[PDB]
C-alpha cells in the first residue's frame, strides 16, 4: 500500500 | 523626508484634505512598514488606515499614492492571519485585481505581491481571491511570446502568486482554477530562471498533493520528464520541490508511478539517497518506499538501477526518519516482490541493518521491520531455506533482539516476535 507563503517587501 | 514618521503624524497627514500630504504620509507608512525590526502593523491597523489605503488604491490620477498604498497593504497583509484578514475586510481584493491592469508595471507587480500574500494566508482567502476573478488578469499578464522579455522580479512575483493560488488543502484549489492555471504553469516550468523554476515546482507539488485525480490532472500535461530533469538540477531550492512533486506523483496509481519511472527518475536516486541534505535523503527514501509498493516490474526496475544497495546503505547509516522510510521501503519490497527479488534483497546485506534497527524505541518501525522479516521468512519457506536465514539472523544478534521483543509492550510487536520465534527458531 502507498502512503501519502507570505513575503514582505523590504 | 518621509523617514521615521510617527503613527500620529501618518494619521494627521492621511486625514488632511491635501492629496500631496496624503501621499507623503502614505509613503511614510510604507517606509515604516517595510522595516525589519518589528514594523508596527498592529499600530497602523488600530489607527484605521487600511480603508484609507484601499481608497488610495483607486486614485488612478495619482499613481504614486497607488503604488505607496499597495506596498503598505502588501506589507500589512504579509503578517499574521488577523492582519491579512484586516486587509481583506477593507475591500482590498477587488482593488488589487483592478490594479492588476494598471499601465504602470510596478503598481501591477505590487498588486500581484499583495494578492499572493492574501491567497497564501490560507484556503479561504485563496478561494475568495479566485472568486473575485484574479486568475484571468494574472494569466493575461503572462500572455507573451517569450517570457524572457518580462522583468525578472515581475515574473518571479507572478510565479509565486500563482503557486500560492495552487497552495493549501482542505479545501483544495478548485478544479476549474487548476485547469486554467496549469498551461501557464507548464510554460513556467521551462523558464531558465532558478527562482521561477523553484516556485513552479512548488506549485506542481501543491497540485499533486491529494487524490489521484489531481495527480492525473497534473500528469496529463506531460510535465514528468521536465520534473525529473529539474530533479537532476544542482540548485537545492529546485531539487526539493521537484522531489516533493515526484513523490506526490508516485503516491498515486501504478500507471502514474510507471510514467515517473519512464522519465528516468530512478537514475537520479543514487545521488538523492546519498544527498548531504537530510530532508532530501528522507524525501527520496519516502519516494523509493512508495515505488517499492508498486507492481513487480517496478520493483524489478528499482533493482536494475542498483538502488537496493543504496536502500541498504540508507538503512545502515542515515537519519532516523530516513531509516524509518527505508524500513517502510523494505517492507513494501518484501510484501510486493517475488521470491527471487527478496533473495536478491537478502544478498545485498539487508538482514544486518534490519536487525540493528530493531533496537529503536519507535514502535512503528519495529512493527515494520517485523513484518519485513516475516515476509523474508515466507520467501525462505517457499525456497526451503528457513534454516540458513535463521542462522543469518542469529549470527548478527537479531535472534536476541526478537527474543527480547517477545516481552514488549505493544500487542502487535510481542505477538509478532513470538510467532517468529516459535515458527523459525525451535
Amino acid at each position: 500500500g502507498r502512503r501519502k507563503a507570505k513575503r514582505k517587501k523590504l | 523626508g518621509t523617514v521615521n514618521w510617527s503613527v500620529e503624524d501618518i494619521v494627521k497627514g492621511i486625514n488632511s484634505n491635501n492629496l500631496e500630504s496624503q501621499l507623503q504620509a502614505t509613503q511614510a507608512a510604507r517606509k515604516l512598514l517595510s522595516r525589519e525590526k518589528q514594523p508596527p502593523i498592529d499600530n497602523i491597523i488600530r489607527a484605521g488606515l487600511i480603508p484609507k489605503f484601499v481608497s488610495f488604491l483607486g486614485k488612478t490620477d495619482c499613481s504614486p499614492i497607488q503604488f505607496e498604498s499597495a506596498w503598505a497593504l502588501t506589507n500589512i497583509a504579509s503578517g499574521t492571519s488577523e492582519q491579512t484578514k484586516a486587509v481583506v475586510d477593507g475591500g482590498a481584493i477587488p482593488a488589487f485585481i483592478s490594479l492588476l491592469a494598471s499601465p504602470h508595471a510596478h503598481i501591477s507587480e505590487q498588486a500581484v505581491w499583495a494578492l499572493g500574500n492574501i491567497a497564501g494566508d490560507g484556503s479561504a482567502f485563496r478561494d475568495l481571491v479566485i472568486k473575485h476573478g484574479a486568475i484571468d488578469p494574472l494569466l493575461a499578464l503572462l500572455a507573451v511570446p517569450d517570457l524572457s522579455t518580462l522583468a525578472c522580479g515581475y515574473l518571479r512575483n507572478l510565479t509565486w502568486t500563482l503557486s500560492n493560488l495552487c497552495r493549501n488543502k482542505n479545501p483544495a484549489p478548485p478544479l476549474d482554477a487548476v485547469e486554467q492555471i496549469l498551461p501557464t504553469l507548464v510554460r513556467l516550468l521551462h523558464h531558465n530562471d532558478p527562482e521561477v523554476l523553484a516556485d513552479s515546482c512548488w506549485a506542481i507539488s501543491y497540485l499533486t498533493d491529494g487524490p489521484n485525480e489531481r495527480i492525473e490532472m497534473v500528469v496529463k500535461k506531460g510535465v514528468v520528464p521536465q520534473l525529473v530533469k529539474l530533479l537532476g538540477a544542482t540548485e537545492l531550492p529546485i531539487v526539493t520541490p521537484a522531489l516533493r512533486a515526484i513523490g506526490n506523483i508516485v503516491t498515486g496509481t501504478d500507471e502514474q508511478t510507471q510514467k515517473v519511472i519512464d522519465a528516468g527518475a530512478l537514475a537520479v536516486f543514487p545521488s538523492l539517497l546519498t544527498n548531504p541534505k537530510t530532508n532530501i535523503q528522507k524525501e527520496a527514501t519516502w519516494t523509493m518506499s512508495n515505488i517499492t509498493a508498486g507492481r513487480q516490474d517496478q520493483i524489478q526496475q528499482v533493482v536494475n538501477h542498483g538502488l537496493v544497495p543504496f536502500l541498504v546503505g540508507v538503512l545502515s547509516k542515515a537519519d532516523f526518519k530516513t531509516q524509518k522510510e527505508a524500513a517502510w521501503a523494505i517492507t513494501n519490497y518484501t510484501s510486493g516482490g517475488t521470491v527471487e527479488q527478496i533473495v536478491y534483497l537478502v544478498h545485498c546485506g539487508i538482514i544486518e541493518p534490519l536487525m540493528n534497527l530493531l533496537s529503536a524505541k519507535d514502535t512503528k518501525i519495529i512493527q515494520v521491520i517485523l513484518d519485513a522479516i516475516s515476509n523474508i521468512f515466507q520467501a525462505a519457506e517457499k525456497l526451503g531455506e528457513t534454516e540458513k536465514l535463521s542462522i543469518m539472523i542469529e549470527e548478527c544478534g537479531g535472534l536476541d533482539k526478537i527474543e527480547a521483543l517477545q516481552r514488549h509492550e505493544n500487542e502487535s510487536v510481542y505477538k509478532a516476535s513470538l510467532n517468529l520465534i516459535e515458527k523459525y527458531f525451535s
Side-chain angles (χ1 to χ4, degrees), chain B residues 219-235:
Chain B
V219 156
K220 295 230 154 112
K221 321 298 275 169
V223 306
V224 176
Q226 184 75 11
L227 279 186
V228 173
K229 165 170 164 182
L230 295 162
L231 179 80
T234 173
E235 301 95 349

PDB file of all heavy atoms in Angstrom, chain B residues 219-235:
ATOM      1  N   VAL B 219      -0.412  15.119 -14.439  1.00  0.00           N
ATOM      2  CA  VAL B 219       0.392  14.237 -15.281  1.00  0.00           C
ATOM      3  C   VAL B 219      -0.012  14.362 -16.747  1.00  0.00           C
ATOM      4  O   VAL B 219       0.837  14.296 -17.645  1.00  0.00           O
ATOM      5  CB  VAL B 219       0.282  12.786 -14.774  1.00  0.00           C
ATOM      6  CG1 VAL B 219       0.576  11.788 -15.886  1.00  0.00           C
ATOM      7  CG2 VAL B 219       1.219  12.566 -13.596  1.00  0.00           C
ATOM      8  N   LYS B 220      -1.307  14.560 -17.014  1.00  0.00           N
ATOM      9  CA  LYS B 220      -1.783  14.629 -18.394  1.00  0.00           C
ATOM     10  C   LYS B 220      -1.121  15.748 -19.189  1.00  0.00           C
ATOM     11  O   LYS B 220      -1.098  15.683 -20.423  1.00  0.00           O
ATOM     12  CB  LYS B 220      -3.303  14.805 -18.424  1.00  0.00           C
ATOM     13  CG  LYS B 220      -4.077  13.619 -17.873  1.00  0.00           C
ATOM     14  CD  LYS B 220      -5.187  13.167 -18.805  1.00  0.00           C
ATOM     15  CE  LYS B 220      -5.510  11.696 -18.585  1.00  0.00           C
ATOM     16  NZ  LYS B 220      -6.862  11.505 -17.993  1.00  0.00           N
ATOM     17  N   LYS B 221      -0.582  16.766 -18.519  1.00  0.00           N
ATOM     18  CA  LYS B 221       0.131  17.837 -19.204  1.00  0.00           C
ATOM     19  C   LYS B 221       1.555  17.451 -19.587  1.00  0.00           C
ATOM     20  O   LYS B 221       2.236  18.244 -20.247  1.00  0.00           O
ATOM     21  CB  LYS B 221       0.151  19.096 -18.333  1.00  0.00           C
ATOM     22  CG  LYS B 221      -1.143  19.348 -17.570  1.00  0.00           C
ATOM     23  CD  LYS B 221      -2.317  19.570 -18.515  1.00  0.00           C
ATOM     24  CE  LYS B 221      -2.409  21.021 -18.958  1.00  0.00           C
ATOM     25  NZ  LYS B 221      -3.380  21.200 -20.073  1.00  0.00           N
ATOM     26  N   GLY B 222       2.018  16.269 -19.192  1.00  0.00           N
ATOM     27  CA  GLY B 222       3.331  15.791 -19.592  1.00  0.00           C
ATOM     28  C   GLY B 222       4.498  16.528 -18.972  1.00  0.00           C
ATOM     29  O   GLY B 222       5.491  16.798 -19.660  1.00  0.00           O
ATOM     30  N   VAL B 223       4.408  16.857 -17.679  1.00  0.00           N
ATOM     31  CA  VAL B 223       5.480  17.579 -17.001  1.00  0.00           C
ATOM     32  C   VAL B 223       6.448  16.652 -16.283  1.00  0.00           C
ATOM     33  O   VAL B 223       7.448  17.128 -15.727  1.00  0.00           O
ATOM     34  CB  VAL B 223       4.904  18.596 -15.995  1.00  0.00           C
ATOM     35  CG1 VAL B 223       3.912  19.512 -16.684  1.00  0.00           C
ATOM     36  CG2 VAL B 223       4.249  17.875 -14.827  1.00  0.00           C
ATOM     37  N   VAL B 224       6.189  15.341 -16.282  1.00  0.00           N
ATOM     38  CA  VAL B 224       7.049  14.416 -15.537  1.00  0.00           C
ATOM     39  C   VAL B 224       8.471  14.387 -16.078  1.00  0.00           C
ATOM     40  O   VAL B 224       9.413  14.385 -15.270  1.00  0.00           O
ATOM     41  CB  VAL B 224       6.398  13.028 -15.470  1.00  0.00           C
ATOM     42  CG1 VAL B 224       7.326  12.035 -14.788  1.00  0.00           C
ATOM     43  CG2 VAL B 224       5.064  13.104 -14.742  1.00  0.00           C
ATOM     44  N   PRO B 225       8.719  14.345 -17.396  1.00  0.00           N
ATOM     45  CA  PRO B 225      10.118  14.416 -17.858  1.00  0.00           C
ATOM     46  C   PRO B 225      10.834  15.681 -17.415  1.00  0.00           C
ATOM     47  O   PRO B 225      11.984  15.611 -16.960  1.00  0.00           O
ATOM     48  CB  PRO B 225       9.984  14.340 -19.385  1.00  0.00           C
ATOM     49  CG  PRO B 225       8.713  13.615 -19.612  1.00  0.00           C
ATOM     50  CD  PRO B 225       7.796  14.055 -18.511  1.00  0.00           C
ATOM     51  N   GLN B 226      10.184  16.841 -17.535  1.00  0.00           N
ATOM     52  CA  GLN B 226      10.790  18.075 -17.047  1.00  0.00           C
ATOM     53  C   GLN B 226      10.952  18.053 -15.533  1.00  0.00           C
ATOM     54  O   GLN B 226      11.924  18.608 -15.007  1.00  0.00           O
ATOM     55  CB  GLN B 226       9.953  19.280 -17.481  1.00  0.00           C
ATOM     56  CG  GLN B 226      10.553  20.627 -17.106  1.00  0.00           C
ATOM     57  CD  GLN B 226      11.733  21.008 -17.980  1.00  0.00           C
ATOM     58  OE1 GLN B 226      11.993  20.376 -19.005  1.00  0.00           O
ATOM     59  NE2 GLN B 226      12.456  22.046 -17.577  1.00  0.00           N
ATOM     60  N   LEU B 227      10.025  17.409 -14.820  1.00  0.00           N
ATOM     61  CA  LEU B 227      10.164  17.285 -13.374  1.00  0.00           C
ATOM     62  C   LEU B 227      11.397  16.469 -13.010  1.00  0.00           C
ATOM     63  O   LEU B 227      12.123  16.814 -12.074  1.00  0.00           O
ATOM     64  CB  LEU B 227       8.905  16.660 -12.773  1.00  0.00           C
ATOM     65  CG  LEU B 227       7.728  17.615 -12.559  1.00  0.00           C
ATOM     66  CD1 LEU B 227       6.589  16.917 -11.834  1.00  0.00           C
ATOM     67  CD2 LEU B 227       8.173  18.860 -11.804  1.00  0.00           C
ATOM     68  N   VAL B 228      11.666  15.395 -13.754  1.00  0.00           N
ATOM     69  CA  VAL B 228      12.865  14.600 -13.499  1.00  0.00           C
ATOM     70  C   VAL B 228      14.117  15.388 -13.868  1.00  0.00           C
ATOM     71  O   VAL B 228      15.133  15.342 -13.159  1.00  0.00           O
ATOM     72  CB  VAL B 228      12.787  13.263 -14.260  1.00  0.00           C
ATOM     73  CG1 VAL B 228      14.098  12.501 -14.143  1.00  0.00           C
ATOM     74  CG2 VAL B 228      11.631  12.427 -13.736  1.00  0.00           C
ATOM     75  N   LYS B 229      14.066  16.125 -14.981  1.00  0.00           N
ATOM     76  CA  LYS B 229      15.200  16.956 -15.373  1.00  0.00           C
ATOM     77  C   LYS B 229      15.538  17.973 -14.289  1.00  0.00           C
ATOM     78  O   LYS B 229      16.714  18.191 -13.975  1.00  0.00           O
ATOM     79  CB  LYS B 229      14.900  17.658 -16.698  1.00  0.00           C
ATOM     80  CG  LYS B 229      15.832  18.815 -17.022  1.00  0.00           C
ATOM     81  CD  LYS B 229      15.631  19.303 -18.448  1.00  0.00           C
ATOM     82  CE  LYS B 229      16.262  20.671 -18.658  1.00  0.00           C
ATOM     83  NZ  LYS B 229      16.034  21.185 -20.037  1.00  0.00           N
ATOM     84  N   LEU B 230      14.517  18.596 -13.697  1.00  0.00           N
ATOM     85  CA  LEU B 230      14.756  19.533 -12.604  1.00  0.00           C
ATOM     86  C   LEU B 230      15.149  18.809 -11.322  1.00  0.00           C
ATOM     87  O   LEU B 230      15.827  19.389 -10.467  1.00  0.00           O
ATOM     88  CB  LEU B 230      13.519  20.399 -12.377  1.00  0.00           C
ATOM     89  CG  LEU B 230      13.173  21.325 -13.546  1.00  0.00           C
ATOM     90  CD1 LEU B 230      11.734  21.806 -13.460  1.00  0.00           C
ATOM     91  CD2 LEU B 230      14.136  22.500 -13.598  1.00  0.00           C
ATOM     92  N   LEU B 231      14.725  17.554 -11.166  1.00  0.00           N
ATOM     93  CA  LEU B 231      15.210  16.736 -10.061  1.00  0.00           C
ATOM     94  C   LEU B 231      16.709  16.503 -10.172  1.00  0.00           C
ATOM     95  O   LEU B 231      17.400  16.389  -9.153  1.00  0.00           O
ATOM     96  CB  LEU B 231      14.459  15.405 -10.033  1.00  0.00           C
ATOM     97  CG  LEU B 231      14.830  14.391  -8.951  1.00  0.00           C
ATOM     98  CD1 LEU B 231      14.164  14.748  -7.635  1.00  0.00           C
ATOM     99  CD2 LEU B 231      14.446  12.985  -9.388  1.00  0.00           C
ATOM    100  N   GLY B 232      17.225  16.430 -11.395  1.00  0.00           N
ATOM    101  CA  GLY B 232      18.650  16.326 -11.618  1.00  0.00           C
ATOM    102  C   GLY B 232      19.414  17.629 -11.562  1.00  0.00           C
ATOM    103  O   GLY B 232      20.605  17.649 -11.883  1.00  0.00           O
ATOM    104  N   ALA B 233      18.772  18.724 -11.158  1.00  0.00           N
ATOM    105  CA  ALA B 233      19.436  20.017 -11.132  1.00  0.00           C
ATOM    106  C   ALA B 233      20.411  20.101  -9.959  1.00  0.00           C
ATOM    107  O   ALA B 233      20.462  19.231  -9.085  1.00  0.00           O
ATOM    108  CB  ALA B 233      18.411  21.148 -11.049  1.00  0.00           C
ATOM    109  N   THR B 234      21.195  21.180  -9.949  1.00  0.00           N
ATOM    110  CA  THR B 234      22.194  21.400  -8.912  1.00  0.00           C
ATOM    111  C   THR B 234      21.727  22.346  -7.814  1.00  0.00           C
ATOM    112  O   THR B 234      22.282  22.308  -6.711  1.00  0.00           O
ATOM    113  CB  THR B 234      23.488  21.949  -9.527  1.00  0.00           C
ATOM    114  OG1 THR B 234      24.400  22.313  -8.483  1.00  0.00           O
ATOM    115  CG2 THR B 234      23.195  23.170 -10.388  1.00  0.00           C
ATOM    116  N   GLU B 235      20.730  23.185  -8.084  1.00  0.00           N
ATOM    117  CA  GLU B 235      20.216  24.111  -7.084  1.00  0.00           C
ATOM    118  C   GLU B 235      19.248  23.381  -6.159  1.00  0.00           C
ATOM    119  O   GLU B 235      18.193  22.911  -6.600  1.00  0.00           O
ATOM    120  CB  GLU B 235      19.529  25.297  -7.757  1.00  0.00           C
ATOM    121  CG  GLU B 235      20.430  26.097  -8.685  1.00  0.00           C
ATOM    122  CD  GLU B 235      20.320  25.653 -10.130  1.00  0.00           C
ATOM    123  OE1 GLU B 235      19.703  24.597 -10.385  1.00  0.00           O
ATOM    124  OE2 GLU B 235      20.851  26.360 -11.012  1.00  0.00           O
TER     125      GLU B 235
END
